[PDB]
Amino acid sequence: MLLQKEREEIVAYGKKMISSGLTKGTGGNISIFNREQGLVAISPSGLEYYETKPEDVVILNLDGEVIEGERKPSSELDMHLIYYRKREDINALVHTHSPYAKTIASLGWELPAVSYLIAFAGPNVRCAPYETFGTKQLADAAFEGMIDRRAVLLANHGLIAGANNIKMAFTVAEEIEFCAQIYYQTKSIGEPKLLPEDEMENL
Amino acid sequence: MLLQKEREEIVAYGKKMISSGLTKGTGGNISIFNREQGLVAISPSGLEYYETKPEDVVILNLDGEVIEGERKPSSELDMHLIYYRKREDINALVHTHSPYAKTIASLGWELPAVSYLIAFAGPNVRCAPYETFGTKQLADAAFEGMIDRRAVLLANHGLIAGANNIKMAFTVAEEIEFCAQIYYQTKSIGEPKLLPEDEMENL
Amino acid sequence: MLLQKEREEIVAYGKKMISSGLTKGTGGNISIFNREQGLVAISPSGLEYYETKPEDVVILNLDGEVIEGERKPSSELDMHLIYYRKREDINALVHTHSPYAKTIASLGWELPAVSYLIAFAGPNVRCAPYETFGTKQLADAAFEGMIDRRAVLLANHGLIAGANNIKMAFTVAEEIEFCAQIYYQTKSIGEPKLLPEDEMENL
Amino acid sequence: MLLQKEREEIVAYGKKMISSGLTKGTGGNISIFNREQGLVAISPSGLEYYETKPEDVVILNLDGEVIEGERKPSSELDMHLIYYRKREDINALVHTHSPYAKTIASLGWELPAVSYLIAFAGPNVRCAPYETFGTKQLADAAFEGMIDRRAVLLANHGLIAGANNIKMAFTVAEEIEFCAQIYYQTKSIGEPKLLPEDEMENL
Ligand SMILES: [Mn+2]
Ligand SMILES: [Mn+2]
Ligand SMILES: [Mn+2]
Ligand SMILES: [Mn+2]
C-alpha cells in the first residue's frame, strides 16, 4: 500500500481524537501529507474510528483524485487539500468537532491569549465565518482564517489545527480545545487576564 | 426468538447510550420496529444496560401487548409505540436522559440552529410541554412536538430521537445532545450566531 | 465474617461511586444496616475503593463500637449511625462528594423540582447548614435536613442519600446528583420550569 | 538505579494525573525529593505518561544538575527545585494543568474557603502572578505564592501542590482542583457561602 506509515498514524490518532473527547460519532477527520510524493492520506468518510483499519484510509493527489483506496474519502477533504497546496509548513491536519472550541466559534469570537498554550497556534486563534459543510467555500474560509497560525475556529462547526507532523497537529488541536475551555469558563464568571502580544512573541 | 437482529442491536446500543453519557442508571430506553411483521422490540424496564441480554429485550405488537419475552417492557413504551403507529419514516427510537438536552428542555426552550448538526433533526428541535412519566399523555406530547422532525425535547425529562434505522436514530440523539451542549454553553456567556432557515433547508 | 453480603456490596458500590464520578479520592462513604442483628457495615476510612476488600469493611453496633474489623471505620460514621437509630425506613446510605450537588449545597440552596427524578428523594431536597466534618453536630444536621426525604444536601460538603436497600440508595444519590446538574446548568442561563407539588405527590 | 522507589512512584502518579483529568498531553510534571541524599527525581520532559518507564525519570541535585538519566528533565524543573531548597516540609510536588484551577488562576483570583477541603492547602489558595513558562521567575512566583500553604494557583497556567509525601501531594492537587470546580460553578449562578477563618484553623 501507498503511504503505509501515514495510514497507520491516521488510524491511531483517529482513536485518540474520539477518546480525548475531541469529536462525536464519525465526525471530524485527519489527514497527513507525504510531501515527497505529493500524496495525501485522509480518514475515510463515516467510519467509526475504532473500526478503521489502515487499508480504509484513502490516498488522494492534490487535485482531490483518489489514487488508492476503496472507501469514500472524508466529505471535508477540500478543507484539508487547500493547506497542502497553499502552504509548505503544514504536513498534517486534525479537524475536530470539540465542544469548547465549537462554543467560542459559534459566538463568532476569536480566542485570545488566555493561556501561554495559545502559543501552540500563535498569538490568538481567529474565527472563520460560517460556510456550508463539505464545500470549497468552507475550505477557503478555513485557510484564510488560519493565515500565519496553526489553528482556526470554524463558526458553528469546530476547529482545524495543522503542524509539521501529526503528533504536533494533534497537540495543537488538543491544547487549543483546552484553551477554549478556559476562555469559556472564565468568561462565564468574570473577565480573564490576557497575555500581552510581546509575551506571545516571546513564547 | 422473534426479532433476533433487533434484540441484539438494542443490547448493543443500550451499552453505547450509557457509555456515551446519554443516560443515567437504568433510565432511558430504545426500540426498533420490524415493519414487515408489525412487531416492536424494546429495552426491558429497569435492567442495567451491561447486564442486558438479547433474550431480555421484549417484543410487543402495536397495541402494546407482549408477544414474546418474560421481562417487563420499558415503562415508557407508549411513547415509542405512537411513532410506529402514526408515522412511517421512523423504524427506531433512542430515548435519552442526557444532561444538555434536558437542560434546554427544563427551561422550556426550543433548540435553534446553533450548529449545522441541528439538521440531523430538522431546522430546529421543539420542546414538548411536561406530561407525567410513563403515560399516554406524554406519548402524545412527544409525538406532537416531533412532527416533521427526527428529535424532540421533553420538558424536565430528556430527549427522544427517531430515524429510519437504529444507527441513525442513535446518531441523531448523540448529535442533538451535542448541539444542546453548544447552545447551553454559548448562552452562558453571550448570544450565539444562528444559521438561517434556507441554509437549514440546504443542509 | 459477619455481614458478608453487606461487605461485598459496600466494596462493589464504592467502586461504582468513584467510577460514576460521585466522589474524589478516598472521600465519601457507604453503609448498610443489618436490621435483624442491629449491626452496621461501613466503608473503611481512607482506603482507595478499588483497593478495598470485603474484609476491610468495618462492622459497628449502633453505639459506634467496632464489633469486627481491623481497619478504622469511616471518619463520617456518626452521620450514618443516626439514620439507623432514628428512622426505620433506611437500611443503606450512600454519602457522596459529587460536584453538582456540592455546588448547590455550597450556595446554601434547596434543590427544587426541576425534574421528575427529584421524586427519588421527595418533593425537593433541603440543604443542611454547615457543620464540621466528622462530628455529631454534622450527623444531627444531616438527619434533620433529611426528615421525610431520601436525600439531603450538606452545605460546602456534598450529599447523603438513603433508601430501603443499597441499590436504591445508590440510585437516589446518582439521580439527585444529576438533578443538581440540571438545576445548576439551567440557573446558569435562565429560570427553570419547576414541577408543581401535587405532581410531585403524584410521582 | 538511584531513587528507584521515587522513580516508580513518579511513573504511577503521572498515569494517575492524566487519568484523573488533571493534565493534558505531556504537560504537567511531578517530582519527589530524597531528603537523605539531597537528590530529586522528576518526570522527563515531553514524554507520554503511559509511555514512561522508571528509567526515564531523571535524577537531579539541588543545583539542577543531572546526576542520573538520559532523558531531558521537565522544562519546569526550576519550579520544583526551589521548594526543596527553601522549605523542609515538602518532599513531593504535583504540578497540574487542570481546567478548574486554571480557570480561577486565569482570572487572577484567589480560591477562598468554599469547601472544608480547602484545608488540604490551608485557609485559602493564593494566585501567583503570571511569569513565563520554564523560568526562574516563575519558580520564585510559585514559591512566594505558596508560603504557609500546600498549593498555589499559577495565573494563566495551572496549579502546583506539595506535601510530605507523593500520596498527599497528589491528594492536595486533586482536592484543590475539585474545590476550584465548586468555586467556578457557584460563582456562575450566585455567591457561595464561605467557611470562617477560625473554622479553617479548626480543620
Ligand atoms: Mn467538520
Ligand atoms: Mn425517560
Ligand atoms: Mn463527606
Ligand atoms: Mn506547567
Residue numbers in the entry:
A (entry chain A), B (entry chain A), C (entry chain A), D (entry chain A): 1 to 203
Copy the relevant paper text.
Here we demonstrate a dAdo disposal and salvage pathway leading via 5-deoxyribose, dR1P, and dRu1P to the mainstream metabolites acetaldehyde and DHAP. The three enzymes, acting together in the presence of ATP, were necessary and sufficient to generate DHAP from 5-deoxyribose, as shown by using a coupled assay to measure DHAP formation. This result fits with the predicted reaction sequence in which the kinase mediates ATP-dependent 1-phosphorylation of 5-deoxyribose, the isomerase converts dR1P to dRu1P, and the aldolase cleaves dRu1P to acetaldehyde and DHAP. DrdA is a unique member of the class II aldolase family of enzymes, differing from most others in both the nature of the metal (Mn2+) and the aldehyde co-substrate. Although, like similar aldolases, DrdA is promiscuous with respect to the aldehyde co-substrate, it is unusual in preferring acetaldehyde.
The metal coordination around Mn2+ is close to ideal tetrahedral in the apo-structure and is a distorted trigonal bipyramid in the complexed structure. Without a supplement, zinc is the predominant metal found in the enzyme, however with an excess of metals included, manganese is incorporated at a higher percentage. These results are consistent with manganese being the preferred cofactor when low abundancy is excluded.
